[PDB]
Structure formats: structure tokens, C-alpha cells
Amino acid sequence: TPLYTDNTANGIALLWAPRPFNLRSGRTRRALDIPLVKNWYREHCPAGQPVKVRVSYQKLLKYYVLNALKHRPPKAQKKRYLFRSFKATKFFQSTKLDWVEVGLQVCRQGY
Amino acid sequence: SSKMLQHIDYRMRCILQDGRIFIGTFKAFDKHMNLILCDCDEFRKREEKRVLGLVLLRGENLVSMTVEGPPPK
Amino acid sequence: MEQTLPVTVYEMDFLADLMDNSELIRNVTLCGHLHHGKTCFVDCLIEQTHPEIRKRYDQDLCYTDILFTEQERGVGIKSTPVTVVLPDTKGKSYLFNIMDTPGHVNFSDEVTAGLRISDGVVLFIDAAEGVMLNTERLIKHAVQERLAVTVCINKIDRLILELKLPPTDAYYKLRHIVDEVNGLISMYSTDENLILSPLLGNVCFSSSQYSICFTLGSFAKIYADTFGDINYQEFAKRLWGDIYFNPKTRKFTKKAPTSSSQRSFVEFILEPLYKILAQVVGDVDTSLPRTLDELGIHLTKEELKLNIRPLLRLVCKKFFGEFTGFVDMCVQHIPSPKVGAKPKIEHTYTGGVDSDLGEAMSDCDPDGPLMCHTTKMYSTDDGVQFHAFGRVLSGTIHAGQPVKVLGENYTLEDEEDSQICTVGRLWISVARYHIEVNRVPAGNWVLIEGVDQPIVKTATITEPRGNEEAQIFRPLKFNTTSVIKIAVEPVNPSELPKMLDGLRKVNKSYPSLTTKVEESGEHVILGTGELYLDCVMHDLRKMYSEIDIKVADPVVTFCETVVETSSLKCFAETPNKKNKITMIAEPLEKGLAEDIENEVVQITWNRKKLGEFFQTKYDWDLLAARSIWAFGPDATGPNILVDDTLPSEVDKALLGSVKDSIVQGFQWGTREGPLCDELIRNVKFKILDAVVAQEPLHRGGGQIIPTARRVVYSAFLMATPRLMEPYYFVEVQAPADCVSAVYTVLARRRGHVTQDAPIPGSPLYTIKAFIPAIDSFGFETDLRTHTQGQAFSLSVFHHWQIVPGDPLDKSIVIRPLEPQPAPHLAREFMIKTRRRKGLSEDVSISK
Amino acid sequence: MSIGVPIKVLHEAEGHIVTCETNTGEVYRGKLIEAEDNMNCQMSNITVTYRDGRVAQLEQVYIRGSKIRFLILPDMLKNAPMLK
Amino acid sequence: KAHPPELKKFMDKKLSLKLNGGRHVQGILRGFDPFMNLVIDECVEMATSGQQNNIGMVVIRGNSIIMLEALERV
Amino acid sequence: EMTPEELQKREEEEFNTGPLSVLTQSVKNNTQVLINCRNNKKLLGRVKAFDRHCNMVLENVKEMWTEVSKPVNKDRYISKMFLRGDSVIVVLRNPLIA
Amino acid sequence: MVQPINLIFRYLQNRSRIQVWLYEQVNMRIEGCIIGFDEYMNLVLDDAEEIHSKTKSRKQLGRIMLKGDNITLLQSV
RNA sequence: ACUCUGGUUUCUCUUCAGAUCGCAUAAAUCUUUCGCACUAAAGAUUUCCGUGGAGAGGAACAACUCUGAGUCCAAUUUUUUGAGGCCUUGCUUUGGCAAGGCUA
């Protein structure tokens, strides 16, 4: 067995990658549940930026801490889904449309 | 060798080369047939019982063995 | 027995029957630098002896950092004993009493408490970091306490996964670590029989995160189990050093066959491990099953789906198995309680081995007189009752057996400190669950209930109605000195008794805690550092006393000294105006005070050896060299009392009548000190004329002692008094770029950098510097914040140095809330300390 | 698959008190120091009883493994993990 | 697989070696083999007749060895 | 052993040119064979199969042994049996009387 | 450290008057001049003579090949 | 080394879940606290976005990889022999047993 392969240096660098890049399997998340900049404002306030930027950093951190602190356990319940109930009745039907068409339909319906 | 794993924990009397009788609880055995017998007693002939305990006998002197008592609790 | 316990690989009946055979017991303490891997090892072993207790996939179950603050801080704070039955390489089982000790430099007292009741030491060293500050300190402490020393080079995976060194350079790094340890041991010890080398089995290599632990013998045994026909013991003797394998001749030579030939350790041990780790972390999907087939490991399908770290742990666990190399090390090179009893009695027993009780204790015979020594006190979570913990050096302790408990002041003539108590229960201590037992023979560690009432720090438990000539074991000699001082006071003065009770309880918990009540009614706690006092106050406010306690600003303890000889020879007379003493004070020679405190010299020596030592070491004539009366406030205080009274001027026989009182007066005077009620250090007191009243009714008792104390004070005050700061020794590890930032942080706090140097084989640097203790509060936080957390420092007390200013100078004006310039720091340190103590605002320099 | 359980049990007996009966009918009771895969026993502090019944004291003894009839082990070894 | 029996503690050591046919032999050990066949320096016969007979350099089959005792302290 | 080859038929070359070929003779030519065994007993019969251990199976055998009184040799008949190899002293093909 | 098989080797080098006991036969000893051994310590003895202890009749056997399973201990002269 | 389970995917239904049930983080109501309540904190309840576990039913293709289970050793150290024969005493269950002395 050779000491190192062509994917040994890269495979070690994955040990220290930030989550989820240190994983090799996992459960899919919703698109809106992934904050892409949450680890940006958790860093130190950047010196040299104008005062508005630093105040924005601190204000983001404030709501982050409040969310983490005021967090409450998700209550136990019984699975009841609205859209399954809608499809069960005879008043609704299913199809597959372009997103833009559905956006236009929702706009007109709300109007 | 299942023919003796079936006999484990059974109260076994083994006959020795010199005529010695060893009654005790069969615990373990190996390929050379060295026997592990716990709370073992030896019966010699004039009747007399000498309580010994945990005996590891070499396969050399072991001759013949027989179940005498069911496994205890 | 009869206690619901986690199921073990062994059975507790075997454990109980092992305790009787003192040749199968190993009393081991795990020690090392901070965060050097000492705790997984315990679970890394608990798991292997507890099928159901496993470590979480994403979180390590410390299982011995059982405390709250231990679990959040992730820092070892208190020693946790573990008693497990561990199999050997040959399949034999031994009972192991393991002391998991904290690695933080502030909590060294827990390490000494563990060292007292242990026969051997397993020093843990990070493979990447190397030998750090606490590793050297613990090596010194262990070889001084006469303990067998072994080394476990933990975290070897960092050489592979983090640093990615070539296997040969990893071998160089390991050899360099071993050589550094050997050099330290030879520095602190004279006899050679403590050579550490993996050829002797002294050194183990391990990576607790990935369940790797092997000596040379255990790896050779892996080879032998795979290929039957090799003798692993002789194989292991060729697996280290500059010995190369020649595959053509199938023999190991001291010369490398041709070129590009690797040493035996690299070829047979380091390269396979490198390849295993590389395969697991790089080719888990491609070429892992094939290599696992080659090694004979078969992993199930859902097992191959694990993340890389759990998969590596699992693969290495399958390949290596149990930690038999560690047990081999500790069985071969750590004495059993029966064999190690004699040095233990020689060192830690006041009666000496020669004593009749000393002999029976040195036999470690469990049918002899009871002699149990307790050094740790563990509090139940309710915080009301404590449980003493210690080893039974002789006899056998029973549950319900009345016992005689001896304190630390108990002597064979002052038998008032002893107290009869009744043992309630006995637990074989494991990290989390206590296994209750009915009796504990000699050579074992036992948790005792019912003897906690009359003991503060340590005790010796014997039997009533026998063992009349039973003395005590020496109180623990700690590595450091408690210097950082804080004052406490309840918010509501009504609940003062509650805070006093809490103070007693914390004094019981922390071995080196010193709680005292000053003259001004001020309660003072002495600690080693900021973390130490933080955790002490956390326990005090939340665990033992449920009241609110105010905390004063941290301050240090000072010492008083002189810098020349007294101008005019002082004199002081008794109120009878008959007895008169004349003394002068001069500074001691350089390096003599340290000799005195470190017991290089003892007044227990005959006058001949004292005289010859002083003559050959500090240019003292025989007259003065044999003239020593006392040795400072204690038996080893840094001050000396010398009589220069001529035989013609004063009759020496009459002087002998007042020698025994002048000694006491001088000891008390040095204990208090005239400046700010602090200890006197590095001062030599010479008596010049001692006029003695012939009538014994005039001298002796309460007339000559105060005169001696007053003359000591006055003689001290003529020669220019100075204050002394405690100086801290800081070691900082930081990357190359942050070294300048470390310099900048140090420069602001009167810091003086001694040396910076690279860490061989690591990308970091070590900066060693000296900082005044008082100019050190928040230094760790300043360093870790200015460097964005990339620099970390541990500080430990080193020595005493003179404050720049002159304490006795009224010309200096100090404002209440401004930092003072160095030219007059001493004046502030003196007057503010006097105000804190409640004394007058200034001294009255006089005769 | 290679080394039998009884040899392992004998390995466990090291350090305890053991009584040894060789084919010459000689009984050796003493502290078992070491044992090998074969019954070669290095054992100490021997109270030795001959066939006639004479008792002697002999501090160091090394018995060839081929020449042991049986070995009586201490009862606490009945709790060895290897006997489960 | 024939591991050498552990007699290094009994090296250079005066020993009494009893035999199969009630014979007994004394001398100092100088080496062995995995079959424990035993070499003796300054060997003394001292048969059951009660008279000690000295030989010197001798080598014994291990198959007839019953029991090995170190007369001198090891 | 210097010959660890799997296709090992040297044991029957022992049964053709070696000392054990004597009993293979009685296997092929079927003559009465006399056996002297360790209990001071003698066995006469016909051998059918055996191996390197010299343990063999016989048929229609007469065994005689003497008992002291003073030594009188008794005889008992056994139809078919099997002797362990190590329990023998000598093996004899009965001589040609003609 | 000195290895039995090698001792047979020098015994055949010296052609010493090697005497060998017998397994369990205390009465009968054999003397002779050794020539060779093997991995099983079977020996060839040139001028061999049986020695008893009760009759003590020295009977010459010529050259012999005493089995290694029967030897007990080799003595010189 | 020969045979018998277990599959995976998808849709629906039922129950439990204080587990970062969710590596994310809304809204409403009530109470308390001080300001003087988007620019504010605490406690509690509720609703929403949407989960895991188990169980049940439906329907689409894989069926023995995996998880299991049932299915070459005669020469010292053990299993390819130092075995058997003679003498005395106590008791003979008159077969001989027990110990010792022997010969091989």
C-alpha cells in the first residue's frame, strides 16, 4: 500500500473544514434554514470600517444572542398537515407549473 | 469439538492413570485435554473424600470421564 | 456488593478478590501538562472495561471531569480516582488504582495529593507540543517524592493528521521528546536507574482520541499474532534506535543496508500507522475495504458509513484492541504496594522506617495494625458531609469499625488533636459511581465516611486501644506557594456564621487553600492564581454557603528584607532593666535563603556538619559557622540567627539559659515583621552582646521574649528595609507572528522577557518571561485578546524580588486612585497594606 | 483458536498460592511466580510433601511442565473473566 | 513455536535436579534449549547410596527432568 | 520438515520401500500376522488397513495371554477389531512353514 | 551461555569417554566414545559397554545407536 | 466451504417526543419590571413555519453484498507410550485392593 495517495492531502484538509464540509453524510436542510453569513458577523468587529458597519455587526450579534438565549423547546404535538387535508377534499387538485406562472396566479388571486 | 462443550458445567468424575477419581464441576478444556474442574473432590480407594477445589490437571494423566450430576444453580 | 452498578467486562467479585493480593495492585497517578490527553485515557479505558458506557460520536465523555465547572470549562480542576481491573498483554489481570490529576499549573496541589498515595507516575506528553512547563515541574516533583516515572507520549496522531511530518521526522520528534525527558530526570535525580526509553518499555505511544495505545512489545505481539513464528519479546528489542532491518539477510543490523534504508521503528511501526490513517481519511470509498481486508478487520456496512473521525476511532480500536501496552508498562516499571511500601514509609512517615510501627507498615501486611493515610476530601453534591479518601498502608479498615483519627498537629506528647470517630461506610471509588464494600485490605484506596469531622487537610486513621506509639504522616509539601490574596465579607453581616462555615468547607476541599482571619477582622483567602481563586469562590458562593459574599480586589503577599548592615548596634532591655540584648541585622549571602528553604541545610544536623557546610559554601569561619541558633520563623525559614558574643565578654553557660528564649523571640519577630506584618526574608541577625540577669526569677518567660522581638524589629529597621514582590514565571506558546504582540503585552506590566525559542517540529514559539505577581491580573486575558486567542500563557510563582522604591520615605505623596510610578511603588505597597491590616498609618522608626 | 483456556487460567494463577503434584507423587505448595504456555511452573516458598509424608521447606522450585499430573488453583480464579 | 523455558533467573546458579528413576543431581547451570535439555558444570552425582560423585561438564535430556531447584538464592 | 508439499504420497512409499511395507504385504497378500503388544499379550490375525501411526484394523483374531498359580496361557477369540499403533512392541508376518 | 546440542558437538570433537544413563533404568548405564548426534539426540557410540549397579558386569556391545528417547544424561570418563 | 430471515423506494394514517425535537429561529396574548415600550428585559401560555421515533395500511422493483442464524500434528511439552513382571504386611468382597521393597 503506498504511503500517500493523490487524494490524501485533500482528505486530511477535510478534517478541519467547517461544518458541513467535515461530514460525509447528513440530512438535507431547508433552503431558508441555511444562514450563509451567520459566521461572518460572529467574528470580531472589523477595525477601520466606518461606525455604521461596526454598529451593524454589534446589532446583528445582539439578536443572535437573544435568539440563542430566548430559545424554547419545540412543543410536542400530533402530525397534522394542512395541504394533505386540502388534497383529501374534492375542492383541490394538483398539477406542476412553472414558478413564474404560479407567482402571477397568486398576484391576481390576492388582487 | 462440540462433543465436550455440551458437557460443560456438568458435575463430572474423571478417571486418572493411577486409579484416582476426580469428581467436580467441568469448566474448561483444551486441545491437549487439560481440564478445569471447580469445587472438585478426589475419591481414592478405603473410601475417603478430599476436598480440593479448582484443579487444572494435565492431559497426560486423564483417562476417562463421566457425568455424575446435573449442573447446579 | 449489593449495589446497582454498570456492567463490566470483568465481575466485581474478581475485583474484590484482587484487592487482597497486594502483588496484583498498581497505584498509579496520571499527570502531565494542561490538555495533554490525561482524561480520555481514563474513559479510553473505562469504555474498554464497560461495554455500555461509550463516548458520544461528536462529544467526548470525560467521565472524570464529573464536576459542573469541570464540564463547562473543560479544564481538570479536581483529582478523580478510578479503580478498574485491566488485562495484561499475556492475559493476566491486575487491579489498577488510577489518579487522574488536573494539568493546569494552578492546581498542582491536587497533583501532590495524588502523588502522596501513589507508587508510580505516568507522565503524559503531547507529541506535537512536546515538553511544556508543567511537564518539567511534575517531573521534578515526581522524582523528588521518590516515585517510579514512566512516560506516555500521547496525541501521536497530531504528527500525522495535523503536522503531516514524514515518518522519519516523526521518529526524530519522538526521540527528541524522550531525550528531553531523560535530561530533565537526570537533572533532578542522581541515580541512573530511571532511564526512560521505549526499548526498556518505559515509554508508550498513544492517541486517546482514536483509541491507539501501544508499546514496542504490544506492537510486536500484534505481529506475532498475525505471523505466529516470531518471538515478540526479542522482536521488540530491535524496534527502536538506529537499528535497521536487512530484508535480504532477514536480520537487524546497527548499520543501514546500503542507502535509503529506514530505521526499524519507521519501517515496522510508524509506516503501517501512517498508512492506516492515510487510507481511512483519504481513500475511505476507494481503497479502504481492501486494506481492512489485509489487516484482517471486517467492518459492517452501516459501520463503514460513519464519519471520518468515528471511523478512524473504530478502525484503530479493531486493529490495536485493548490498552495492553499501558498495563505492561505499569506492571513492569511501577512497584506494587508491597514492594513500594518501604520508600513510602521512608519518605512520608514521621517515625522513619526504623520505627517498630514503621517496620509493620513497610511489610504492607493486611493483618497488622491499621494505618490509613488520607489526602483528599470529596464532598457529596449536597455539600453537607465529606468523604475522606486515602490508601490503607497497613492493617484492614472495616465498615462500622471505630477508629482514632490523628490530625496534623498530633504528636506523641500532645495527644489532644486525635479524636475517636466511627466509620460509616466504605466505597471503592470509581470516577462516577461508588461501589460500596464492607472492608478494604492494605495497599488499596478507600472512600471513608464518618471521619470527615475532625480533619482539615490530611489525617492518619489508626485503631483505638492499640497502636499507642502511632505518629502521623508528614503534611503535603506543595510545589508552589499561595501568593494571590483576596478578602471576603458577607453582604448581610447577620449571616457571617454561614460564610465562616463555607470557608471551613472550602478549606477542607482545596488542599493548598489557606483561609486566615487578620487582626482587623478581615477574612483572607490565599490562592495560586486567578482560575484557582475563581473556582474557589464559585464553590464558596454556590456549593457550601448559599449566601452572597463580597470579594475584594486581588492582592499579593509581600515579604520584608534589608540591603545593608544596621548603622548603630541596636539594644533592648527587659522591663526589669536587668537583661539586655544587642543585635545587628545584615543581608544574607546570595543563594543561601533558597538553600535553607529547600532543606539543603537543617538545624537538625550536628554542629560539625553545619559548620563545615557553611565554611565550604559561603566563606564562614568555624566560630560563626557553628554559631547558628535558629533558622528563621520556621525550622526552614529564610532567616538565620547567629551569636557573636565572645566567651570572655559574656559567660556562655549563662547565655545558654536565654538562648532558648532569644530563638523564640526571633522566630516570632520574623513571623510578624515590623513593616506591614509580612514575613521577613533573606536577613541575617547577629547578636553582639546579651547581658543576662543571674537571677532566674527575672529572666525567662514573658519578660525576655518581648525584649527579643523588639530588638529584632529595631535591628531590622536600622538597615534599610525593603519590600519584596512575588515574581511569576510565564510560559507563552504562540505562533511566530504573534511573538511581537506577546512582547508588547508583556512590556506594559513590568514584564521582562528572558527568552523566546522555536518549538522543534512545531510551527509555534515558546516565550518565557518574568512578571511581577501584582502586575499580572488579567495578563492572560490581555494576551489572549490582543492575539485573537492565538497565544496562551500559564504563570507560576518563581521567586521574590525587591520592589523598586523605599518603603520608609514620607516624602512621597500618593493619590488614592492612580497607578504609581516605579520610583515609589514600595511606599504605596507598604502603607496600603498597613491600612488593609488595620495597623497605624505609618511605622515609628526608633530603638 | 490457538491457546487453550486452561493455560490462560494457569497464567492467571501467578502470584497466588498453588499446590503441585508431580508424577513422582510429590506435593509442592507455594507461591506461583511464573508459568508458560506449557505447564513449566516457576514457584516459590514450597511446603513439599513426599510420598511417605515427609514435609520439607524449599524456597525456589522450577517444575517441568510435562511432569505435572494436576494443579490445584485458588478458588477466587473461579471468578476470572476468562472462566465466563 | 517451541518457546525456550525461562531459566535465565537460574543462570550460573547452583541447582539440585531430581530424575525419573528416583535419581537426583546437583550442579550449576550453564545453558538450556527449548526442550530444556540441561547442561551442568561441577556436576555431582550423589546417588541414593549416599556418596557424592563429581563429574563436571554434563548434559541431560529434558524428558527425564522432574523438577529444578536453585539451592543458592536467586 | 523439508518436504511440505501438498501432494504428499511419500507415506505409501514408506508402505512400499520403508519398514512399514511389511504390514502392507499382509494387506495385499493376506497372510496371518502375529502381534506382540505392551500388556505382555500376543495377537494373531489379518490386517486390512493402517497408516504411519501403525494403528490397524484386523479380522478373525486370536489373542493369548498368560496368568499366574503359575503362568498358564489362555486364549479368547475376537471377530473384528482395531489396535492402536503405539500399544505394540513388535509386528510379525507369520513364517513360511510349507 | 552454552547450548546442549553444541555440547554433544564438542563431545564428538573430543571423542571423550561419554557415558549415558537410561530412561527409568537406573541400574543400567552405558559408556563409550561418541561420534555423532542428530536433531533428536540419537547418538552413535563407538566402543560401548553396559554397566549394571548390582551385578556390575561390563558387557561390550561394539558400535551402537542408542535412541534419543531412551537417553537421560551424558557424562564423561 | 451448503441452506432460512431481514430489503430499498414511494403515498397515506395513528401515537409519543424538553432531543440543537430545528447546527435555524417568527408572531400573538397575559403577568412583572423599570422607563415616560419597534427602537426593552424577565416569566408563562398559545398559534404558526417543519421535524424525529414507533406502529398501521397502500404500491414500485431487488431479492441473498451486507446483518445474522441454521451448518495440513508418531521421535522430549501433552493424543501414537516405559509399558509390564517378582516379594511382604492389614483386610480377603479368596477376585484381589492399599503401601513399601524390587526386576526390567
Ligand SMILES: Nc1nc2c(ncn2[C@@H]2O[C@H](COP(=O)(O)OP(=O)(O)OP(=O)(O)O)[C@@H](O)[C@H]2O)c(=O)[nH]1
Ligand atoms: N488530536 C488529539 N486531540 C486529543 C487526543 N486526546 C485528547 N484530545 C483532545 O485534547 C483535549 C484534551 O482534553 P483532556 O484530555 O480532557 O485534558 P487533560 O489531559 O485531562 O488535561 P486537563 O484539562 O488539565 O484535565 C480535548 O480537546 C481532547 O478531546 C488525541 O489523541 N489527539
